[PDB]
């Protein structure tokens with residue numbers, strides 16, 4: 001659920017999901033079209049796609065459990081949907097951390113009309 005995800009992001013990067021990653025570029029947030037503006041936005045695109053492989057799961061509200069094993073995120077056993085949601089979120093958090101160096105405030109509150117082009121998962 002968004003609760004586990006925003007907490008995962010905060011622990012990883014130091015930034016809060018909202019508003020550092022809720023209205024970023026073309027894919028971080030409500031976003032769902034265009035060409036990712038940068039690496040961080042590409043993390044959200046892939047995260048999007050990852051949730052995309054789980055049509056019968058509800059990523060926003062289904063809660064999962066996870067623990068830190070010396071920094072490393074370890075998804076704990078839950079239902080099938082919860083395990084996969086967690087893997088999707090774990091990947092995005094790490095991707096976010098790996099690209100913190102290029103995070104640009106230029107792509108914050110990014111206009112919808114500048115999300116141009118197309119990309120398939």
Ligand SMILES: CN1c2ccccc2[C@]23C[C@H]4[C@H]([C@@H]5CC(O)N4[C@@H](C5)[C@H]12)[C@H]3O
Nearest residue numbers: 031032047048049050051052054055059
């Ligand atoms: C295509 N679409 C879907 C088609 C059928 C069921 C569920 C989904 C989505 C909505 C949502 C989310 C991610 C992130 C995203 O932008 N959306 C994608 C993948 C999915 C995922 O949940």
Ligand SMILES: COc1ccc(C(=O)O)cc1
Nearest residue numbers: 002017018021022029030
């Ligand atoms: C990062 O926080 C959120 C909250 C709600 C939604 C949504 O409702 O689609 C997406 C991200």
